[PDB]
Amino acid sequence: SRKTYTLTDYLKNTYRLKLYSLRWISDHEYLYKQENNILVFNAEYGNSSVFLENSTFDEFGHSINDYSISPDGQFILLEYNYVKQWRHSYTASYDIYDLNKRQLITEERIPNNTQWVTWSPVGHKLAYVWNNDIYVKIEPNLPSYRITWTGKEDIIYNGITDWVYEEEVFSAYSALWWSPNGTFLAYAQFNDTEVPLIEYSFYSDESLQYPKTVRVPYPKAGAVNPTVKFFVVNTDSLSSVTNATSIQITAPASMLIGDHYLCDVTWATQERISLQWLRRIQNYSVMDICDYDESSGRWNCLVARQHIEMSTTGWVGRFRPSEPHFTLDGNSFYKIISNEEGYRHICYFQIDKKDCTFITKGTWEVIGIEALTSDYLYYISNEYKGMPGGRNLYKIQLSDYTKVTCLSCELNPERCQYYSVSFSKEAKYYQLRCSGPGLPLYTLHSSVNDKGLRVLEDNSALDKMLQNVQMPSKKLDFIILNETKFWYQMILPPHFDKSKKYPLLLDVYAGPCSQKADTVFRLNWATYLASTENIIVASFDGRGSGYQGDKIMHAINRRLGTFEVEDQIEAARQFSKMGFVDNKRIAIWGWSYGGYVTSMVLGSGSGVFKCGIAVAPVSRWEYYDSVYTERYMGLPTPEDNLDHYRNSTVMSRAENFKQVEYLLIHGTADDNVHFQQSAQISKALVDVGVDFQAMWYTDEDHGIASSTAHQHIYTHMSHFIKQCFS
Amino acid sequence: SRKTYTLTDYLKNTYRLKLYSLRWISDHEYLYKQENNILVFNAEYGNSSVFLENSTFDEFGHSINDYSISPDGQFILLEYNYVKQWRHSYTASYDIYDLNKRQLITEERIPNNTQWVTWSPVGHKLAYVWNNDIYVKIEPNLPSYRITWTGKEDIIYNGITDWVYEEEVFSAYSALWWSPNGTFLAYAQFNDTEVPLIEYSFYSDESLQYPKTVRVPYPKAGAVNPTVKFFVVNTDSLSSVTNATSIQITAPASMLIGDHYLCDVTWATQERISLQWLRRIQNYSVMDICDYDESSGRWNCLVARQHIEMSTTGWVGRFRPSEPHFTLDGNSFYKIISNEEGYRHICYFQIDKKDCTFITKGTWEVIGIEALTSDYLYYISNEYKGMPGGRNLYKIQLSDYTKVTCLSCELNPERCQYYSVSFSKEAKYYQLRCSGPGLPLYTLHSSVNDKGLRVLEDNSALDKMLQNVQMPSKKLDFIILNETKFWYQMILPPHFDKSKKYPLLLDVYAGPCSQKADTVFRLNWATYLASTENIIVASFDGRGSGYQGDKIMHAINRRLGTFEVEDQIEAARQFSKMGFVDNKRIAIWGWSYGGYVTSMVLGSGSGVFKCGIAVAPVSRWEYYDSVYTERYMGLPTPEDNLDHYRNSTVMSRAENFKQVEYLLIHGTADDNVHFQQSAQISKALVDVGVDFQAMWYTDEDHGIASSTAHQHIYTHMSHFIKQCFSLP
């Protein structure tokens, strides 16, 4: 009855989801990138015009992998010679096209190997980083003003983050923030002088005679961290005969007393900036609010105007303290924080008042604040139907907190229970993005009355393609572990029959604040497994899970490798007793933190799992980065948590691996979870005489995403899974 | 009843081959260590006495890894804190024990982390290397004299070899040579300033937070090679000048013209030293004979005493130029070189006459010269029965070369066909060591009449245990191709039945001058595969193999990855034709050069082999060291042999791997055949979407010899072979 969704369909991307990536250029229009050009759309009516046909550069001489139009609409930044570095970082060459004269700028161009570029928020000023220093161009074709002169590879970073700040703090390579109208350029400076370097071989193409050694400043748990400083420069004052003057904003004293991090920067007004700092022991943070002083020329951060955010049950924030949303005058702000009961809700602050007022409450949480107007605060939460894995857009009336309206819950309940949003500049319009449980649905709306203007993309095409294939279904439900309920999902094989017994694969991650049971529609490996191999692929969110309150999330505080691994086993245990689950054929697999939990479960002696696959797993927390690890584990010292750091390794369970079939996989050029972690696991298994399966991927990183490697690993894992299940 | 030889038997070393390791301290006595008490024996009567009691060093605070008694036997060097490095090199701590006063010396001790220590050949002088510099101690308790000040980590090596000289040039770590009576100390100096570094991670124990990066000066094919200098210093002047001058002996001009190597150094007399040099293009070699000029205090090498040795079809020597053996007076010497018929035989040289006189036969080869007396010259060869895989001890009468006697051939023809020997200091006695085809047998003889004095060890214990197990058998024979015979061996399952069809595993190496078919008795993995799994494990010595003449050994000159590979495929076809092999279950495996061949065969498209396993394989010759690679391949340049370098990689045959089951294994800390080699193979396979099996071994080197790692790899390979053959 029709074909199934095969491995090749997945690996070759036969059935592709359509998207609608737009970028608002004002409160009324937005740009829409296409294959052959770029169009500007009028949100009110839906009509459009061509901004440029790309063919404008058919003879540019280079392949452009990205365009960036000045908020001005007068210039286009052309990026090419792209070279990826870490998850967000990369280098590239840049050319600027002057749209006024429709001519490429030939003078004073951006240097090759530029690390980062960004237009100012309003006109056409540019700030970029080259060789670790900051540069500013007031006009696209004029000479640049050198802002910093201390940049030095692997030592001093100006305007860009180092490895650990890029990955675990800002999730970005950029370390510069323009003020609202472009007057000031704020930036951070990182000093990795005493930060140890992780080193690993990179083999490159066959033609390279000698392997090269990659070295990157990377702080593992307890090691020396990079230090940070913050500055602000006035881009309207830069001379040309004189060096630029950058003003530093330091302290707070409660932070300077020891190791700390800069964890958030958000401008409040044209002359007021907010900064959030976090102590190395991540259960205490402080927000400073600094104002410019023309007469003194400094940036003053009045005490009494700062706000302390701490936690007695765990760390601060889901992954870091939340971003504040300042009112128009910048005298007050809204921000998500953990309420008295441990659930995250919106709290309303006055910049000089100590206590804030929660404007939302209940046993559910706010995911994020998306827009703020004098009229309403728009946000996304999982309140609807009490489903932690679902998400809807709401608006709360700032004059009457009793008037909360769900703007997406009812649009199409059967198809849409998971949304994300994108508001125009002043929130006059918003694009809704439904991503499950049905096919993605993109729509446009107007805020004044929340009218549904039009459908932007409904994936009707794809829908017609899948009706011809035996697709699996998704069951989202829960089980109860003494008092508390925990959710799980199952990707079910076509024509599922509870009378029949199916082999089950536990797909796991389970890191702090993770969520693997949700209402999102996915076309992945699990789809193939259930559709072609008739394997049920389950996922479970137990202790440590997010979006359900701190009682659940902080349950594994200072105790990674305990409750989240046990709950994973407990869940698997209840699944086996279900009846439509063959208890003799149950497997488990995960990537990264998921590889860690997979490995820990397999070495627990549960006897529940037959086989398991660990990809790029963490094996012992002392090998992982400081920011992430310490957030949950504290410091690896005897005074603190060294004992648990030593009790939660994978290698300590080696002996228990004699009862299962294990497949260990890792990319040799993994800069995140070092290949070292899996090399130590295999050595421990060898020392105990445990046979297992292994696969290394040379020169692949944490994503093992090169086209051929991606195909190889899934092909290799599939053989392993069906071999185990047959 | 009666069990077979199980994997565990092999992995747990249940059946052990007893040995009899002795050390001659004179022409009449030898030392024999019994794990606890080191006693000394009298060759003549066999009576012994304790030389050093068991407890003598208890409370030492350290475990003695090894002992070393000085020539005059007055002192003993205690080696502890051993830390292995490469194949022969290792660092350690040392203490000297005064036997004259039963005192442990505590003054001016040898430094910790000392790289190498050696007694003078006479007396009790000492020469050691620390931080790449040479130091000399005239008296065990007195302060040392520094000889070199140029020592520099990974840059300048004094008295010790760099990586490639240790592994490929000398097959030894030490780079210093005391003169016979100990007056002079000769040494070489290696400058690796311009030599590229191979870098790889070493993870160490779990406790190490950040992995260490190992970097070793290692010249790959065609890269810059270390340069060498040779010096000779007079140690008897150390206590009179403050800074004794090291006299340099350079040239030859024919060598200085371009890249070269110092390949051998041996003293001829108290004042005569011979040096052998080899051009980077290893088809030309020169030996200088230099005499000390008591007048100018310099060392001069007369050109009339210079001996050239070149090759028109291949390289010089089996792996390098042959070592000379000088007559007592140093005016003439013997040396193994290939004759006009391509066979390696011993010829007699006079130091100032260029034409040498061959003293041995033809259709076979001399393996090595073992001892030289005024009367006879003793050597080992494979002449007996025309079996290239057998080894026997002979002796030829120096005054009449027609008089040659075999001393080992007839001792026990059924049990012994492979011998090695150890002569006493003046060749008055000698121990014979038989290693196959029966169980090892050690005997002691007196050279006067070659009379057998007694049996030192006959492995009677082992013999008994084995009569209680179904052991496999071994067949050694040959096959004829293009009218040339090629030898092979097969380890046959118990109760072999030529009427049945057995699965077969081709055990390969096949490197230049290699020999995998011989008479040696072995208790290894193959023993288990045959005995327990009933699999036939075979080996074939094809073109390129050694001990059979240059016609066969040089067949692969400048052509690695060809004939040698094709011949292993033919061997499997030839074995199949024998009628007792299952055409559907033929596999192949190898280690190192054997991994390269296994891989090249699996990617050949033959379809003779179902599955294969490659351990630490070479994948492309441009990744292997210069000395070994260039010897057979020349330079990887377009003007020379680059085309074949590029045409002989394993990666270029990845597509062909879709039709076979492949298992690739490699140690991550392999300093010899770099992990890089397998890393590029796996990547090539991933690039064409071919599935395969893999296993890396964290921190294991080329030997993957750690106890746990050893048991693990053989256990893993067994699962693969059994699964491939549908066993058990």
Ligand SMILES: *[C@@H]1O[C@H](CO)[C@@H](O[C@@H]2O[C@H](CO)[C@@H](O[C@@H]3O[C@H](CO)[C@@H](O)[C@H](O)[C@@H]3O)[C@H](O)[C@H]2NC(C)=O)[C@H](O)[C@H]1NC(C)=O
């Ligand atoms: C080992 O071999 C290297 C060659 O790679 C030798 O290094 C070379 O040493 C000479 C010393 O005469 C250097 O020349 C000097 O260069 C400086 C420039 O900084 C100049 O001021 C001096 O007047 C002189 O010309 C040469 O640069 C250097 N080459 C390299 C690549 O380092 C080294 O001496 C050898 N060591 C031994 C113990 O043989």
Ligand SMILES: *[C@@H]1O[C@H](CO)[C@@H](O[C@@H]2O[C@H](CO)[C@@H](O[C@@H]3O[C@H](CO)[C@@H](O)[C@H](O)[C@@H]3O)[C@H](O)[C@H]2NC(C)=O)[C@H](O)[C@H]1NC(C)=O
């Ligand atoms: C024992 O004698 C040897 C041989 O003379 C001494 O070695 C030599 O020592 C000098 C000075 O330490 C080395 O440096 C030289 O410096 C000059 C001037 O800067 C420069 O022009 C030369 O190129 C060289 O770098 C010299 O290279 C070195 N030569 C050798 C063969 O080692 C040694 O220092 C003496 N030991 C004692 C304790 O006096």
Ligand SMILES: *[C@@H]1O[C@H](CO)[C@@H](O[C@H]2O[C@H](CO)[C@@H](O[C@H]3O[C@H](CO)[C@@H](O)[C@H](O)[C@@H]3O)[C@H](O)[C@H]2NC(C)=O)[C@H](O)[C@H]1NC(C)=O
């Ligand atoms: C980046 O951060 C560095 C420290 O992590 C700053 O530096 C400071 O710390 C070093 C120690 O690493 C001090 O000492 C250095 O010099 C002495 C003497 O030469 C050495 O003995 C010592 O080992 C260090 O190499 C420096 O004195 C100190 N710097 C200053 C200016 O006092 C570094 O300045 C900083 N860079 C920037 C741009 O902020």
Ligand SMILES: *[C@@H]1O[C@H](CO[C@@H]2O[C@@H](C)[C@@H](O)[C@@H](O)[C@@H]2O)[C@@H](O[C@@H]2O[C@H](CO)[C@@H](O)[C@H](O)[C@H]2NC(C)=O)[C@H](O)[C@H]1NC(C)=O
């Ligand atoms: C999209 O079209 C509008 C004009 O649309 C028409 O007029 C509207 C009032 C309404 O009746 C629609 O149904 C009609 O189709 C463009 O508006 C013009 O914008 C330019 C500058 O951008 C301005 O000079 C004109 O005065 C505007 N016209 C009107 C009537 O206001 C708009 O520019 C179009 N957007 C794009 C991206 O093409």
Ligand SMILES: *[C@@H]1O[C@H](CO[C@@H]2O[C@@H](C)[C@@H](O)[C@@H](O)[C@@H]2O)[C@@H](O[C@@H]2O[C@H](CO)[C@@H](O)[C@H](O)[C@H]2NC(C)=O)[C@H](O)[C@H]1NC(C)=O
């Ligand atoms: C081994 O024993 C000999 C003793 O030899 C004896 O006489 C022989 C003719 C023969 O009958 C043997 O069986 C006898 O045991 C020791 O030889 C002595 O050596 C010392 C010098 O070291 C010498 O001064 C003595 O005269 C020798 N003894 C005789 C009788 O001549 C020899 O030392 C013993 N070696 C060991 C290692 O124990």
Ligand SMILES: *[C@H]1O[C@H](CO[C@@H]2O[C@@H](C)[C@@H](O)[C@@H](O)[C@@H]2O)[C@@H](O[C@@H]2O[C@H](CO)[C@@H](O)[C@H](O)[C@H]2NC(C)=O)[C@H](O)[C@H]1NC(C)=O
């Ligand atoms: C960035 O480099 C490009 C390419 O130049 C080459 O590659 C560089 C990495 C470096 O190795 C240069 O020496 C190479 O020439 C520059 O583009 C120009 O390209 C033309 C032809 O392709 C060449 O004749 C020019 O010399 C190159 N450079 C200049 C200044 O003309 C590009 O200009 C460089 N970026 C900047 C800001 O100059």
Ligand SMILES: *[C@@H]1O[C@H](CO)[C@@H](O[C@@H]2O[C@H](CO)[C@@H](O)[C@H](O)[C@H]2NC(C)=O)[C@H](O)[C@H]1NC(C)=O
């Ligand atoms: C701006 O500041 C920079 C950094 O101090 C100055 O540049 C350095 O000037 C010194 C002295 O001339 C040179 O030795 C360095 O090579 C320069 N570069 C660096 C990175 O230090 C620069 O001179 C200053 N310019 C003005 C106008 O004051």
Ligand SMILES: *[C@@H]1O[C@H](CO)[C@@H](O[C@@H]2O[C@H](CO)[C@@H](O)[C@H](O)[C@H]2NC(C)=O)[C@H](O)[C@H]1NC(C)=O
């Ligand atoms: C961008 O913001 C800056 C800072 O508020 C504005 O600059 C100020 O302009 C006022 C004029 O009303 C001056 O009195 C201040 O001295 C300026 N401050 C500084 C630091 O220069 C600027 O006007 C804003 N830009 C625009 C286009 O409105």
Ligand SMILES: *[C@@H]1O[C@H](CO)[C@@H](O[C@@H]2O[C@H](CO)[C@@H](O)[C@H](O)[C@H]2NC(C)=O)[C@H](O)[C@H]1NC(C)=O
């Ligand atoms: C933030 O974390 C620190 C460190 O875990 C807490 O301080 C420690 O608390 C434990 C008891 O819970 C004591 O044994 C230690 O002596 C305390 N100090 C240190 C340096 O470890 C601190 O209480 C936490 N803050 C909050 C608000 O809970």
Ligand SMILES: *[C@H]1O[C@H](CO)[C@@H](O[C@@H]2O[C@H](CO)[C@@H](O)[C@H](O)[C@H]2NC(C)=O)[C@H](O)[C@H]1NC(C)=O
């Ligand atoms: C062994 O070493 C030398 C070998 O040259 C012997 O000969 C002496 O050598 C030195 C040169 O180093 C000359 O100055 C002496 O004249 C040589 N001796 C004679 C008698 O001419 C030396 O005799 C031997 N030393 C020992 C300890 O045996």
Ligand SMILES: *[C@H]1O[C@H](CO)[C@@H](O[C@H]2O[C@H](CO)[C@@H](O)[C@H](O)[C@H]2NC(C)=O)[C@H](O)[C@H]1NC(C)=O
């Ligand atoms: C040893 O082999 C080398 C191979 O490099 C020979 O080198 C040269 O001479 C050959 C014969 O005349 C030429 O065919 C080669 O092209 C040339 N090699 C180079 C790099 O130019 C060398 O002659 C041989 N020596 C002997 C004695 O045969």
Ligand SMILES: *[C@@H]1O[C@H](CO)[C@@H](O)[C@H](O)[C@H]1NC(C)=O
């Ligand atoms: C309660 O549930 C948790 C996890 O669901 C489990 O670890 C624990 O044993 C149960 N009982 C108690 C008293 O905590």
Ligand SMILES: *[C@@H]1O[C@H](CO)[C@@H](O)[C@H](O)[C@H]1NC(C)=O
């Ligand atoms: C060698 O090292 C040990 C341990 O550090 C030390 O006790 C001993 O004195 C050292 N010996 C020498 C000769 O330096």
Ligand SMILES: *[C@@H]1O[C@H](CO)[C@@H](O)[C@H](O)[C@H]1NC(C)=O
């Ligand atoms: C004949 O050539 C060699 C012997 O010279 C032999 O090994 C081979 O099998 C035969 N044929 C071919 C094509 O090599």
